[PDB]
Amino acid sequence: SSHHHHHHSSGLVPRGSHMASMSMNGIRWIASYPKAGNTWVRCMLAAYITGKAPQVWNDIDAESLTLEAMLRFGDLPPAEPMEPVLVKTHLKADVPVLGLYGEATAKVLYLVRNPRDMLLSSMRMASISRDDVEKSRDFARKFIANEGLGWNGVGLGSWPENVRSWTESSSDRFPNADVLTMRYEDLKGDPVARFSEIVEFLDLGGPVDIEDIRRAVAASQSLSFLGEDIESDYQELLHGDSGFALYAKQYGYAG
Amino acid sequence: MNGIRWIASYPKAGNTWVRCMLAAYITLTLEAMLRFGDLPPAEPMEPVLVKTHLKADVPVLGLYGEATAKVLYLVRNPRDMLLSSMRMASISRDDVEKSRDFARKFIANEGLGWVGLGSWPENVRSWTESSSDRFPNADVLTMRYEDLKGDPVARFSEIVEFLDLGGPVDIEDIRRAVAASTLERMREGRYDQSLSFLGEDIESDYQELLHGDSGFALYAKQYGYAG
Ligand SMILES: COC(=O)[C@H](Cc1ccccc1)NC(=O)[C@@H](N)CC(=O)O
Numbered sequence: 001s002s003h004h005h006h007h008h009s010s011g012l013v014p015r016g017s018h019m020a021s022m023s024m025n026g027i028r029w030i031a032s033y034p035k036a037g038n039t040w041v042r043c044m045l046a047a048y049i050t051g052k053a054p055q056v057w058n059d060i061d062a063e064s065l066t067l068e069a070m071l072r073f074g075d076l077p078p079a080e081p082m083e084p085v086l087v088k089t090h091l092k093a094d095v096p097v098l099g100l101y102g103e104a105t106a107k108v109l110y111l112v113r114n115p116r117d118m119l120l121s122s123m124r125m126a127s128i129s130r131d132d133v134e135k136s137r138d139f140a141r142k143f144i145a146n147e148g149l150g151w152n153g154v155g156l157g158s159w160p161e162n163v164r165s166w167t168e169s170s171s172d173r174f175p176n177a178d179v180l181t182m183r184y185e186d187l188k189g190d191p192v193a194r195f196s197e198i199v200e201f202l203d204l205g206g207p208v209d210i211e212d213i214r215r216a217v218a219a220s221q222s223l224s225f226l227g228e229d230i231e232s233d234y235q236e237l238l239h240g241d242s243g244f245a246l247y248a249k250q251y252g253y254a255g
Numbered sequence: 256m257n258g259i260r261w262i263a264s265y266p267k268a269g270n271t272w273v274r275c276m277l278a279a280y281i282t283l284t285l286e287a288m289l290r291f292g293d294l295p296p297a298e299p300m301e302p303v304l305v306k307t308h309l310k311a312d313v314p315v316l317g318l319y320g321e322a323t324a325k326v327l328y329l330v331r332n333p334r335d336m337l338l339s340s341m342r343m344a345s346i347s348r349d350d351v352e353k354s355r356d357f358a359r360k361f362i363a364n365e366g367l368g369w370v371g372l373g374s375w376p377e378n379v380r381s382w383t384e385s386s387s388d389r390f391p392n393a394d395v396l397t398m399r400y401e402d403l404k405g406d407p408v409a410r411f412s413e414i415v416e417f418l419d420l421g422g423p424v425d426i427e428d429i430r431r432a433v434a435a436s437t438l439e440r441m442r443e444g445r446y447d448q449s450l451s452f453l454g455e456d457i458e459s460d461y462q463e464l465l466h467g468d469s470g471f472a473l474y475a476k477q478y479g480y481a482g
Pocket residue numbers: 034035036037038039040121220
């Protein structure tokens with residue numbers, strides 16, 4: 001009977017090195033809005049580093065693996081890390097806590113997704129069938145009204161807030177950090193190509209093994225049906241120079 | 256004076272009630288904040304009351320050694336906590352089935368944390384032996400929830416004075432606070448402090464926990480919860 005985290009340790013003793021005889025340290029944030037890619041990348045990453053992907057049945061499971069779940073219990077990733085630390089979060093780049101990793105942060109992976117999809121996939125978080133249209137409308141109505149899911153100057157923020165925080169992060173909040181940005185739809189289109197780019201970009205050490213990545217991969221909408229006014233109101237969001245719209249058009253989710 | 260004030264207790268062991276009567280007097284929850292990535296100020300002009308159930312020695316609270324003015328720890332007979340927690344887990348205590356499961360996991364873990372809350376003794380030690388390293392500016396007051404219920408007036412008095420929130424404290428002003436904090440709550444088992452009603456073995460095992468070598472027993476006996 002072994003501990004459920006044994007795969008996170010080599011368990012080799014005494015420990016040896018490939019770098020010495022006789023990749024850059026820092027935090028790697030895997031960041032996205034809910035249902036916008038960072039759980040999948042966070043699972044794939046485990047598979048690559050560890051050999052074994054975590055067991056994620058639902059959103060509660062997925063939330064276990066975030067900075068936020070870690071915070072609810074008073075823990076924190078290291079701020080003076082001696083190695084690569086990968087931490088998933090959906091939090092906005094400018095919430096106070098992440099103030100502590102200014103110097104610490106090495107890499108930012110930000111993933112965005114079509115908010116149509118985020119919106120629907122989210123409706124499964126709140127435990128809504130496709131048949132309680134009533135509940136759906138209320139959720140979508142509250143989503144469209146908020147331009148996102150942060151309804152209960154911090155937390156997730158609106159979609160455009162979240163996006164602007166991480167994508168603009170390198171300039172001030174994370175000076176030593178490089179930032180890569182990837183649309184979920186692209187990942188889903190070419191997952192092996194794309195995840196190999198992510199692993200290069202995250203600089204965990206050594207040559208990316210494209211076979212190591214293929215195995216690590218294998219492990220892994222209109223709103224009319226809710227009502228005219230839903231689809232309609234969401235479409236106002238995509239019109240503008242104002243923010244939701246700017247981002248929706250830059251990421252190819254408006255037309 | 257100015258600095259952080261922790262209102263700390265195990266779940267359902269006091270701090271909410273007290274955070275209510277301070278609220279009522281005047282007119283922050285650490286874990287809730289933290290879940291949004293928010294932190295109480297580490298450089299404060301004002302006094303800052305913050306309620307937490309976490310054990311004092313969690314990393315996050317390490318950001319606060321200098322910032323911390325006072326600690327109020329609240330403590331409560333575990334039996335009663337064990338039973339209020341049951342209701343928090345949204346289980347009727349007509350339903351012995353789930354109730355048993357729950358009590359059994361409580362006793363197995365010497366508390367409600369199955370980092371974090373900690374066991375019950377880990378939590379008590381954490382805040383009662385903590386000025387020692389974690390919060391060396393702070394003055395620390397422990398208090399049994401029982402006695403608070405016993406003399407809300409004379410005990411809450413002790414509190415408001417101790418935290419030093421607002422100049423001088425009037426008994427009039429105080430009276431209105433324990434009024435609402437209970438009048439509000441009031442709108443919202445065996446009588447011998449026994450768990451036998453959930454079956455003998457359960458009582459048997461809590462009893463063993465209370466009268467062994469384990470620390471739970473230690474802190475129990477020193478506060479008047481070992482009978
Ligand atoms: C954060 O990641 C997600 O929300 C997961 C990640 C994922 C994608 C594809 C295959 C497995 C897992 N995806 C979704 O929410 C789903 N909505 C994907 C879909 O509907 O096609």
